[PDB]
Scaffold this motif. Structure first.
Motif, PDB file in Angstrom:
ATOM      1  N   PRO B  46       0.835  -1.205   0.000  1.00  0.00           N
ATOM      2  CA  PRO B  46       0.000   0.000   0.000  1.00  0.00           C
ATOM      3  C   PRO B  46       0.864   1.247   0.000  1.00  0.00           C
ATOM      4  O   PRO B  46       1.919   1.294   0.637  1.00  0.00           O
ATOM      5  N   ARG B  47       0.420   2.254  -0.736  1.00  0.00           N
ATOM      6  CA  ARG B  47       1.177   3.485  -0.875  1.00  0.00           C
ATOM      7  C   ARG B  47       0.535   4.601  -0.065  1.00  0.00           C
ATOM      8  O   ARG B  47      -0.669   4.602   0.202  1.00  0.00           O
ATOM      9  N   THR B  48       1.366   5.556   0.335  1.00  0.00           N
ATOM     10  CA  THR B  48       0.892   6.675   1.126  1.00  0.00           C
ATOM     11  C   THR B  48       0.203   7.704   0.238  1.00  0.00           C
ATOM     12  O   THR B  48       0.384   7.738  -0.984  1.00  0.00           O
ATOM     13  N   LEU B  49      -0.599   8.552   0.889  1.00  0.00           N
ATOM     14  CA  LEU B  49      -1.369   9.578   0.195  1.00  0.00           C
ATOM     15  C   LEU B  49      -0.470  10.587  -0.501  1.00  0.00           C
ATOM     16  O   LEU B  49      -0.685  10.901  -1.679  1.00  0.00           O
ATOM     17  N   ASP B  50       0.561  11.068   0.194  1.00  0.00           N
ATOM     18  CA  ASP B  50       1.523  11.969  -0.425  1.00  0.00           C
ATOM     19  C   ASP B  50       2.376  11.265  -1.468  1.00  0.00           C
ATOM     20  O   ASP B  50       2.847  11.914  -2.401  1.00  0.00           O
ATOM     21  N   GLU B  51       2.562   9.947  -1.348  1.00  0.00           N
ATOM     22  CA  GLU B  51       3.275   9.210  -2.387  1.00  0.00           C
ATOM     23  C   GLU B  51       2.477   9.160  -3.682  1.00  0.00           C
ATOM     24  O   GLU B  51       3.034   9.373  -4.770  1.00  0.00           O
ATOM     25  N   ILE B  52       1.173   8.887  -3.583  1.00  0.00           N
ATOM     26  CA  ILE B  52       0.314   8.898  -4.766  1.00  0.00           C
ATOM     27  C   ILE B  52       0.232  10.303  -5.350  1.00  0.00           C
ATOM     28  O   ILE B  52       0.285  10.488  -6.576  1.00  0.00           O
ATOM     29  N   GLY B  53       0.133  11.316  -4.481  1.00  0.00           N
ATOM     30  CA  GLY B  53       0.108  12.691  -4.954  1.00  0.00           C
ATOM     31  C   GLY B  53       1.403  13.112  -5.622  1.00  0.00           C
ATOM     32  O   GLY B  53       1.391  13.876  -6.591  1.00  0.00           O
ATOM     33  N   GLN B  54       2.532  12.604  -5.129  1.00  0.00           N
ATOM     34  CA  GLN B  54       3.818  12.895  -5.744  1.00  0.00           C
ATOM     35  C   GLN B  54       3.938  12.235  -7.109  1.00  0.00           C
ATOM     36  O   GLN B  54       4.369  12.873  -8.076  1.00  0.00           O
ATOM     37  N   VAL B  55       3.544  10.963  -7.217  1.00  0.00           N
ATOM     38  CA  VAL B  55       3.705  10.277  -8.497  1.00  0.00           C
ATOM     39  C   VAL B  55       2.635  10.646  -9.510  1.00  0.00           C
ATOM     40  O   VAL B  55       2.791  10.330 -10.695  1.00  0.00           O
ATOM     41  N   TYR B  56       1.553  11.303  -9.094  1.00  0.00           N
ATOM     42  CA  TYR B  56       0.553  11.770 -10.044  1.00  0.00           C
ATOM     43  C   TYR B  56       0.520  13.285 -10.202  1.00  0.00           C
ATOM     44  O   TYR B  56      -0.284  13.791 -10.991  1.00  0.00           O
ATOM     45  N   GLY B  57       1.366  14.015  -9.481  1.00  0.00           N
ATOM     46  CA  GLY B  57       1.546  15.432  -9.740  1.00  0.00           C
ATOM     47  C   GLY B  57       0.411  16.334  -9.312  1.00  0.00           C
ATOM     48  O   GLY B  57       0.178  17.363  -9.953  1.00  0.00           O
ATOM     49  N   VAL B  58      -0.303  15.983  -8.246  1.00  0.00           N
ATOM     50  CA  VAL B  58      -1.334  16.859  -7.700  1.00  0.00           C
ATOM     51  C   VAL B  58      -1.200  16.896  -6.186  1.00  0.00           C
ATOM     52  O   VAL B  58      -0.280  16.300  -5.618  1.00  0.00           O
ATOM     53  N   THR B  59      -2.116  17.595  -5.528  1.00  0.00           N
ATOM     54  CA  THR B  59      -2.080  17.763  -4.085  1.00  0.00           C
ATOM     55  C   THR B  59      -2.819  16.634  -3.382  1.00  0.00           C
ATOM     56  O   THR B  59      -3.614  15.905  -3.982  1.00  0.00           O
ATOM     57  N   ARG B  60      -2.552  16.511  -2.080  1.00  0.00           N
ATOM     58  CA  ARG B  60      -3.115  15.411  -1.307  1.00  0.00           C
ATOM     59  C   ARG B  60      -4.616  15.570  -1.101  1.00  0.00           C
ATOM     60  O   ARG B  60      -5.338  14.569  -1.040  1.00  0.00           O
ATOM     61  N   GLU B  61      -5.112  16.807  -1.030  1.00  0.00           N
ATOM     62  CA  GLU B  61      -6.548  17.006  -0.888  1.00  0.00           C
ATOM     63  C   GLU B  61      -7.272  16.671  -2.183  1.00  0.00           C
ATOM     64  O   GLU B  61      -8.370  16.103  -2.158  1.00  0.00           O
ATOM     65  N   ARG B  62      -6.653  16.987  -3.324  1.00  0.00           N
ATOM     66  CA  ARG B  62      -7.189  16.563  -4.612  1.00  0.00           C
ATOM     67  C   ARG B  62      -7.191  15.045  -4.733  1.00  0.00           C
ATOM     68  O   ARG B  62      -8.153  14.458  -5.246  1.00  0.00           O
ATOM     69  N   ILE B  63      -6.126  14.399  -4.247  1.00  0.00           N
ATOM     70  CA  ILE B  63      -6.022  12.942  -4.303  1.00  0.00           C
ATOM     71  C   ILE B  63      -7.105  12.295  -3.449  1.00  0.00           C
ATOM     72  O   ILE B  63      -7.794  11.368  -3.890  1.00  0.00           O
ATOM     73  N   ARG B  64      -7.309  12.806  -2.232  1.00  0.00           N
ATOM     74  CA  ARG B  64      -8.312  12.204  -1.362  1.00  0.00           C
ATOM     75  C   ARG B  64      -9.731  12.531  -1.821  1.00  0.00           C
ATOM     76  O   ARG B  64     -10.643  11.729  -1.602  1.00  0.00           O
ATOM     77  N   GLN B  65      -9.932  13.659  -2.509  1.00  0.00           N
ATOM     78  CA  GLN B  65     -11.245  13.936  -3.078  1.00  0.00           C
ATOM     79  C   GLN B  65     -11.550  13.007  -4.246  1.00  0.00           C
ATOM     80  O   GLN B  65     -12.676  12.503  -4.366  1.00  0.00           O
ATOM     81  N   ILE B  66     -10.552  12.763  -5.103  1.00  0.00           N
ATOM     82  CA  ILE B  66     -10.706  11.811  -6.201  1.00  0.00           C
ATOM     83  C   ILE B  66     -10.961  10.411  -5.657  1.00  0.00           C
ATOM     84  O   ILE B  66     -11.809   9.672  -6.173  1.00  0.00           O
ATOM     85  N   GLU B  67     -10.272  10.056  -4.570  1.00  0.00           N
ATOM     86  CA  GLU B  67     -10.472   8.763  -3.925  1.00  0.00           C
ATOM     87  C   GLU B  67     -11.875   8.630  -3.344  1.00  0.00           C
ATOM     88  O   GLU B  67     -12.502   7.573  -3.468  1.00  0.00           O
ATOM     89  N   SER B  68     -12.387   9.693  -2.711  1.00  0.00           N
ATOM     90  CA  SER B  68     -13.738   9.654  -2.157  1.00  0.00           C
ATOM     91  C   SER B  68     -14.791   9.531  -3.251  1.00  0.00           C
ATOM     92  O   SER B  68     -15.752   8.760  -3.116  1.00  0.00           O
ATOM     93  N   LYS B  69     -14.614  10.272  -4.349  1.00  0.00           N
ATOM     94  CA  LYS B  69     -15.540  10.177  -5.475  1.00  0.00           C
ATOM     95  C   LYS B  69     -15.502   8.796  -6.116  1.00  0.00           C
ATOM     96  O   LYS B  69     -16.550   8.233  -6.456  1.00  0.00           O
ATOM     97  N   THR B  70     -14.307   8.223  -6.263  1.00  0.00           N
ATOM     98  CA  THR B  70     -14.187   6.894  -6.845  1.00  0.00           C
ATOM     99  C   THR B  70     -14.753   5.828  -5.923  1.00  0.00           C
ATOM    100  O   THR B  70     -15.333   4.845  -6.398  1.00  0.00           O
ATOM    101  N   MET B  71     -14.607   6.008  -4.613  1.00  0.00           N
ATOM    102  CA  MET B  71     -15.197   5.071  -3.670  1.00  0.00           C
ATOM    103  C   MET B  71     -16.713   5.142  -3.711  1.00  0.00           C
ATOM    104  O   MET B  71     -17.390   4.118  -3.581  1.00  0.00           O
ATOM    105  N   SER B  72     -17.264   6.339  -3.921  1.00  0.00           N
ATOM    106  CA  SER B  72     -18.702   6.452  -4.135  1.00  0.00           C
ATOM    107  C   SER B  72     -19.132   5.764  -5.425  1.00  0.00           C
ATOM    108  O   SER B  72     -20.172   5.090  -5.462  1.00  0.00           O
ATOM    109  N   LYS B  73     -18.334   5.919  -6.483  1.00  0.00           N
ATOM    110  CA  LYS B  73     -18.658   5.307  -7.768  1.00  0.00           C
ATOM    111  C   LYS B  73     -18.641   3.788  -7.681  1.00  0.00           C
ATOM    112  O   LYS B  73     -19.487   3.114  -8.278  1.00  0.00           O
ATOM    113  N   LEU B  74     -17.691   3.233  -6.933  1.00  0.00           N
ATOM    114  CA  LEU B  74     -17.672   1.790  -6.738  1.00  0.00           C
ATOM    115  C   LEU B  74     -18.763   1.340  -5.785  1.00  0.00           C
ATOM    116  O   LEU B  74     -19.283   0.230  -5.925  1.00  0.00           O
ATOM    117  N   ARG B  75     -19.136   2.180  -4.823  1.00  0.00           N
ATOM    118  CA  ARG B  75     -20.187   1.813  -3.890  1.00  0.00           C
ATOM    119  C   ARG B  75     -21.560   1.858  -4.532  1.00  0.00           C
ATOM    120  O   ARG B  75     -22.511   1.324  -3.952  1.00  0.00           O
TER     121      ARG B  75
END
Ligand SMILES: [Mg+2]
Ligand SMILES: [Zn+2]
Ligand SMILES: [Zn+2]
Lengths: 1270, 87
Positions: B46-75
């Motif tokens: 498992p990768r850290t939030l800032d690690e995913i944000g670093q390798v995808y070139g955005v901020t951690r709040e953007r990453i966690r918002q995208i994650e929350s939206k995707t978790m809703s989409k899968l739910r």
DNA sequence: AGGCTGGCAGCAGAATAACCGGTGGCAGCAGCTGACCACAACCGATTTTCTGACC
DNA sequence: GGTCAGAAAATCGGTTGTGGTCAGCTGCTGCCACCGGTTAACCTCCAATTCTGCTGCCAGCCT
């Protein structure tokens, strides 16, 4: 060799493990006797379960917890030490224990013959005293320093003995002065004449014991000097005091020690090449006991010399430790633990070794240290084999622990409990009932068992039909049994065979493959025609259902093992799906003919015509449905669809009556017409009465002329009509159907008078206690036969009991005689006949004493039948193990050899009488040479199958001998050929090129056990068969002649003595101690004095030993003798085995030769080598310099010829596992996995059947025109 | 042997991984990569939030918002039924 | 004068009760954190696209 | 009776801000679990049958 155990095998080589191999296998040294921490249950550090040594307990999860992923793989945790990998490496990693003193292996010292004793030339009682710390042993000695110090030390010894003599003469003079003082103080005292001299006699007695003590110490010094002057290596020294004296006086010139260290030193100071040269010099020169001893030493010395082995591996420096998943510590439900008894043995070894290290590094006296070393040695011996030397080590409750060697031996070992017979998945049992509406290829399967067997198939199918969404919900639906699963189960069970097996599986038709169908119930409905093959009643017997999975397995169970492809028995060729007992009563009633029944044809005329004729069987059936015609009355039908017999056909139509159309008139019954409508269209009209032998002949003729599908359908139609007419037959038993004979009282009185006269004559005293027993037994045997004859002539021909007996359905006539009539005589616990007899029949009712007498024989018969099945199973096991390597490998050996066959010997008046045993001797084997009749042409050419028309043609042309081709003369190297085997008895064609004819022969011989009764000192039942196949010397050993000539009979005291006078003036041959009970042989006349005998005539009654007839009359006449003596045991009980099933076993005894002269090539005398290896060596050796090794034929039993095989893996799994492994290790023997039991153990394809390279590499593709047209 | 391979949980686990791969592949690439790196479905790490944000070139709040939206989409049940039966 | 040959005899093996000192583990818990969710707001363009007036 | 600046929407994304929040040790402190050493009237040797091959043994011709 690789050890990853991927399936690319060629060999499996076993050797003798050295210490540098053991500490190269191991992964670390276990050095504490700890297993598991008592509170936290984690494996302790450096213990018996340590994860640092044997790998981690949790998959990819190290101990301390620092690395816990599959990302870390193969890394070593630098704090705790465990590497991170799977947890299945705890069954694959070993450790070792570093012993502080060497220890000998128990296998190479104790098991007779002791290989250490043979190598070092030490007696076992003088070897146990060395290695168990009771006697010293001189390991080495000096020679030249000993040589000059002999002179110097004998000078010193003479000086020391002279000083001893100086002190001795000081004793002499001191006692002389003491006696003179006694003279001075007793020469003037007035006393008795002897009392003044008894003190001087006591002083002289003191002088006598002083010089006796001087003699004792001088003898001690003499013994010390003698045992120094006769000192040599491998010489034991008992009396520790004497060895101590030799050590402190003569500390130079020799070295001595005590124990396994001394044994290791002796093995190091040992030259195998010089020892072997000395041994071969002895076996070339000397004779007798020394030569036999040198041969038995040269076995193991040549074994250690020829290979790259070293003898130093018989002592140990590092025991290895079995991995901790093979000796598990398992926590039960509730904190109870379970260990596997090896942890106690390893803990005792580790405890004693640590204590010994402590004592040695501390510094302790020799008594303590030697006791510790002896204890360590006993611990390692008890680890490797418990209970071999001394008392077994016991646990709690006084049971012996299970050591390492006890995992391998016996019926509970690995080789017999887990490698050859395993539990299997996809299987189940139930209790069989009769299924008389089924076809022959069908079986009823209950739905509750079929659902559990076919659960994965039904899970796949009800996921694919969208009754469920996935495997988990499908499994929940199946286990809750929702009603869609039956509609799925029918479609997945369609056309998928299962195997049904009933234990015990005596022969190969005990496993058969039916096609299942669902049945509401819980019983496996079996067909009623396969119960003879399965040997199954319905008294509660149970059957096991397996299931084939792969495509190859389903094709095998559909083609090879299907139920309607095995009609004929593989032993004799008689049909086994023939109707039995109930269809036999039905068909016998249907086809019998009653004279004077209703509607019988009668030609009475003058006023009216015949009124018995009919125009068709349809009109006859209508008349029988009315009350006019009985089925069993003689009529004259006009048949149009049944083929006439050959005489009527040739009379009316001549040649070509196309029997669909033509019409002819038959004077039969109607039952025979209804019977012949079941047989096929081309089969001629039978018109007989269907006794069971007639039905067997019909089904055999059908199976030899028609396809097997036609035979199966005919057998089913016969079953249906047989049951239907068995119901309407009126077969019932009542008490009025068991008639008693009306003259039984008169017959019993007429024999009672003679019995009373014999007993009166015994009371008179004219005959002893045994002659009256013999006379009474003869009288009552005659009375029993007379009562049986009166009963047989009294019973009507249409009684139910006599119809059941006479139709061949069940039973014999003696059971009817005991039911109505007379029970007869009865046996004893000893076996003699009680001469009472039992004069009451079971209809009249036995009385109290007669019933109590009868119970003896009944219970003895029950116990004997209990024992005989285990005995027959053991015999079948040994026959399978000998003959497992006889499979068919070619199509033609292309030899011109062959045996001769007796084939209907001549009659004295002049005609040809058929020999009775011709269906088991001459049928179904290929001719070897042509048959030529009395200066004529060929009747049957070479290569024909020699069936019934060939035999009829030969007997019509009038010849008596043929030269037929047999497997005793098959000339292929490995396995018999196929034209030498002849036809297969189970198919009727030639045998295929992968058949396992040895296993078929062994099961065919060993299956008719439990119907070989002994008698009622020649054995005559089952143990007669066992002592023939083991080639033992018999009980009634009747001698044979050695040369043709005249017998000179001599009668000594109470017995005989025979010396044969040769015609050629040779040496006289003497047989002396032939006892009283052996009566003389009778041929044609009793053997008198002055009679003439041939070279191999048996002299007395009894049993010639098979070693002797081989030595006199060559290897051919022991093959006649063994087949003839076995077949006279089976023929006495009416059992048919073809002779080609005995010749497979007999050819496997005479494979080897014994060496008498070594010649020049590596063959020690008295050894048994294979003959194909013998002749291949002689052609290589007598080329470029002729030194031929001479050999004689030998005959060996079926237990020596299966332990002296070529594979150490098939031999160890048979018998004597410890002895087979312990000398395959010394020879460094290699197995090639060519066998048929080595491949079963390692789990690959057997090399017989569909596992040979001719059949396994078939390339299947669509053809050219059908690839294009689709 | 109460700790052996039960022979239906292994095939059920394989089918669960197959279905999860399918449902993750029916999404957008950035959201699918974010979910895989967040829950460690790539290589078990498992990768850290800032690690995913670093390798995808955005901020951690953007990453966690995208994650929350995707978790809703899968739910959402439309994507969620075929995995809802597995648990 | 003994020796090494011969059966003869006898036997192993296989199958069917306290102290004292010390030392390291250990668990329990305030107490620095310090990285981390985590809501929650707040802006930084961004693009559309009306909204509003301009002449 | 049409063109151009401003206002007003989500939208993708950076700031940011602090408000806890959870763990990660970190002493550390008490304690507890475990290993090792020591005790000075005397009393000093254990609890079935069957078959085959091997070895030990004794008379007894031979030198
Ligand atoms: Mg039964
Ligand atoms: Zn670790
Ligand atoms: Zn052949």
């Amino acid at each position: 060799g690789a050890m990853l155990d991927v399936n690319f095998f060629d060999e499996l080589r076993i050797g003798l493990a050295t210490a540098e191999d053991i500490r190269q296998w191991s992964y670390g040294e276990v050095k504490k006797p700890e297993t598991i921490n008592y509170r936290t249950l984690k494996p302790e550090k450096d213990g018996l379960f340590c994860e640092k040594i044997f790998g981690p307990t949790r998959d990819w999860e190290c101990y301390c917890g620092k690395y816990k992923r599959v990302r870390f793989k193969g890394i070593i945790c630098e704090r705790c030490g465990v590497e991170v990998t799977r947890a299945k490496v705890r069954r694959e990693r070993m450790g070792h224990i570093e012993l502080a003193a060497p220890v000998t292996h128990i296998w190479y010292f104790k098991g007779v013959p002791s290989r250490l004793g043979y190598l070092l030339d030490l007696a076992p009682k003088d070897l146990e005293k060395i290695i168990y710390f009771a006697a010293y042993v001189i390991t080495s000695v000096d020679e030249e320093m000993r040589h000059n110090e002999l002179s110097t030390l004998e000078a010193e010894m003479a000086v020391e003995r002279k000083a001893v003599e100086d002190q001795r003469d000081g004793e002499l003079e001191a006692r002389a002065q003491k006696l003179e003082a006694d003279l001075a103080e007793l020469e003037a005292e007035g006393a008795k004449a002897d009392a003044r001299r008894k003190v001087r006699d006591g002083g002289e007695r003191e002088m006598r014991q002083i010089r006796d003590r001087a003699q004792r110490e001088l003898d001690r010094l003499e013994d010390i000097w003698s045992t120094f002057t006769k000192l040599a290596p491998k010489q034991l020294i008992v009396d520790e005091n004497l060895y101590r004296e030799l050590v402190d006086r003569y500390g130079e010139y020799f070295t001595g020690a005590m124990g396994a260290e001394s044994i290791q030193k002796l093995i190091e100071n040992f030259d195998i090449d010089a020892e072997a040269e000395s041994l071969r010099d002895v076996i070339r020169n000397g004779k007798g006991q020394k030569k036999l001893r040198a041969l038995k030493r040269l076995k193991v010395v040549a074994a250690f010399q020829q290979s790259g082995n070293s003898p130093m591996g018989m002592v140990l420096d590092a025991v290895p430790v079995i991995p901790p998943e093979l000796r598990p510590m398992v926590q039960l439900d509730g904190g109870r633990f379970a260990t596997s008894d090896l942890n106690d043995l390893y803990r005792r070894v580790i405890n004693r070794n640590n204590r010994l290290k402590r004592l040695i590094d501390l510094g302790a006296p020799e008594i303590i240290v030697n006791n510790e070393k002896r204890m360590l040695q006993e611990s390692v011996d008890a680890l490797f084999d418990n209970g071999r030397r001394g008392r077994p080590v016991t646990g709690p409750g006084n049971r012996p622990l299970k050591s390492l060697s006890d995992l391998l031996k016996g019926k509970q070992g690995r080789f017999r409990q887990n490698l050859l017979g395993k539990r299997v998945d996809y299987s189940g049992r139930s209790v069989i009932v009769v299924g008389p509406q089924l076809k022959l290829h069908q079986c009823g399967l209950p739905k509750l068992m079929a659902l559990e067997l076919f659960k994965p198939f039904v899970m796949k199918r009800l996921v694919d039909l969208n009754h469920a969404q996935n495997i988990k919900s499908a499994k929940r639906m199946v286990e809750r049994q929702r009603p869609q699963v039956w509609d799925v189960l029918e479609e997945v069970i369609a056309e998928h065979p299962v195997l049904l097996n009933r234990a015990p599986t005596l022969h190969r038709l005990g496993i058969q493959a039916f096609e299942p169908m669902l049945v509401e119930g819980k019983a496996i409905q079996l067909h009623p025609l396969v119960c003879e093959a399965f040997n199954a009643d319905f008294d509660g017997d149970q059957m096991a259902v397996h299931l084939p999975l792969s495509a190859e397995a389903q094709a095998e169970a559909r083609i090879l093992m299907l139920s309607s492809n095995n009609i004929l028995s593989p032993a004799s060729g008689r049909p086994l799906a023939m109707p039995r007992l109930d269809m036999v009563t039905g068909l016998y009633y249907l086809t019998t003919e009653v004279p004077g029944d209703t509607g019988e044809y009668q030609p009475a005329s003058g006023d009216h015509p015949e009124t018995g004729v009919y125009s068709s069987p349809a009109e006859a059936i209508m008349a029988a449905d009315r009350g006019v015609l009985s089925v069993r009355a003689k009529i004259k039908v006009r048949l149009t669809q049944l083929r006439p017999p050959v005489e009527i056909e040739a009379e009316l139509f001549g040649h070509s009556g196309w029997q669909p159309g033509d019409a002819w008139m038959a004077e039969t019954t109607l039952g025979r017409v209804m019977f012949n409508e079941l047989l096929p269209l081309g089969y001629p009209f039978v018109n007989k009465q269907m006794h069971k032998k007639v039905q067997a002949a019909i089904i055999n003729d059908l199976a030899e002329r028609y396809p097997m599908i036609v035979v199966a359908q005919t057998v089913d139609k016969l079953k249906d009509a047989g049951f239907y007419w068995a119901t309407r037959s009126g077969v019932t038993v009542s008490m009025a159907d068991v008639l008693v004979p009306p003259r039984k009282k008169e017959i019993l009185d007429h024999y009672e008078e003679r019995a009373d006269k014999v007993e009166k004559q015994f009371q008179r005293g004219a005959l002893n206690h045994d002659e009256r027993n013999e006379a009474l037994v003869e009288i009552w045997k005659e009375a029993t036969d007379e009562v049986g004859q009166a009963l047989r002539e009294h019973y009507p021909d249409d009684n139910p009991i006599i119809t059941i007996v006479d139709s061949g359905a069940t039973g014999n006539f003696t059971q009817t005689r005991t039911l109505a009539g007379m029970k007869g005589l009865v046996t004893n616990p000893k076996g003699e006949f009680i001469p009472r007899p039992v004069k009451s029949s079971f209809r009249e009712g036995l009385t109290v004493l007669e019933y109590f007498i009868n119970t003896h024989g009944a219970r003895k018969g029950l116990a004997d039948t209990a024992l005989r099945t285990a005995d027959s199973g053991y015999l079948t096991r040994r026959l399978v193990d000998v003959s497992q390597d006889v499979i068919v490998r070619e199509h033609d050996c292309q030899t011109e050899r062959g045996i001769v066959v007796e084939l209907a010997e001549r009659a004295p008046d002049g005609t040809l009488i058929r020999d009775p045993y011709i269906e088991t001797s001459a049928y179904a084997r290929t001719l070897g040479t042509d048959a030529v009749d009395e200066a004529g042409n060929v009747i049957v050419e070479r290569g024909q199958d020699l069936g019934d028309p060939e035999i009829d043609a030969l007997l019509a042309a009038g010849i008596t001998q043929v030269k037929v081709r047999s497997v005793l003369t098959c000339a292929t190297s490995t396995g018999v050929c196929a034209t030498c085997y002849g036809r297969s008895m189970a198919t009727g064609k030639l045998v295929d090129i992968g058949e396992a004819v040895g296993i078929v022969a062994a099961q065919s011989i060993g299956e008719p056990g439990t119907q070989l009764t002994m008698r009622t000192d020649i054995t005559g039942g089952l143990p007669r068969v066992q002592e023939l196949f083991e080639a033992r010397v018999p009980r009634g050993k009747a001698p044979i002649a050695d040369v043709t000539g005249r017998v000179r009979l001599e009668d000594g005291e109470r017995f005989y003595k025979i010396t044969i006078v040769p015609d050629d003036g040779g040496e006289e041959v003497v047989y002396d101690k032939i006892s009283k009970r052996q009566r003389l042989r009778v041929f044609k006349r009793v053997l008198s004095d002055g009679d003439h005998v041939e070279v191999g005539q048996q002299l007395m009654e009894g049993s010639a030993d098979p070693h002797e007839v081989l030595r006199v009359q060559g290897p051919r006449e022991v093959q006649i003798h063994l087949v003839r003596e076995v077949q006279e045991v089976y023929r006495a009980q009416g059992v048919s085995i073809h002779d080609k099933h005995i010749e497979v076993i007999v050819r496997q005894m005479l494979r080897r030769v014994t060496i008498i002269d070594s010649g020049s090539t590596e063959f020690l005398p008295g050894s048994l080598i294979d003959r194909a290896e013998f002749e291949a060596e002689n052609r290589r050796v007598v080329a470029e310099g002729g030194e031929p090794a001479a050999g004689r034929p030998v005959l060996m039993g079926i237990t020596k010829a299966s332990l002296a095989t070529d594979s150490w893996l098939s031999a160890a799994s048979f018998q004597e596992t410890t002895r087979v492994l312990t000398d395959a290790a010394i020879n460094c023997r290699s197995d090639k996995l060519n066998g048929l039991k080595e491949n079963v153990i390692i789990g690959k394809l057997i090399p017989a059947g569909t596992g040979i390279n001719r059949y396994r590499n078939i390339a299947v593709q669509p053809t050219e025109e059908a690839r294009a047209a689709a | 042997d109460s700790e052996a391979v039960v022979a239906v949980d292994a095939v059920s686990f394989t089918l669960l991984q197959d279905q999860l791969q399918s449902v993750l592949d029916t999404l957008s690439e950035r959201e699918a990569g974010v979910v895989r790196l967040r829950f460690g479905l790539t290589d078990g790490q498992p990768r850290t939030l800032d690690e995913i944000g670093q390798v995808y070139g955005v901020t951690r709040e953007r990453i966690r918002q995208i994650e929350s939206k995707t978790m809703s989409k899968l739910r959402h049940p439309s994507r969620s039924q075929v995995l809802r039966d597995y648990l």
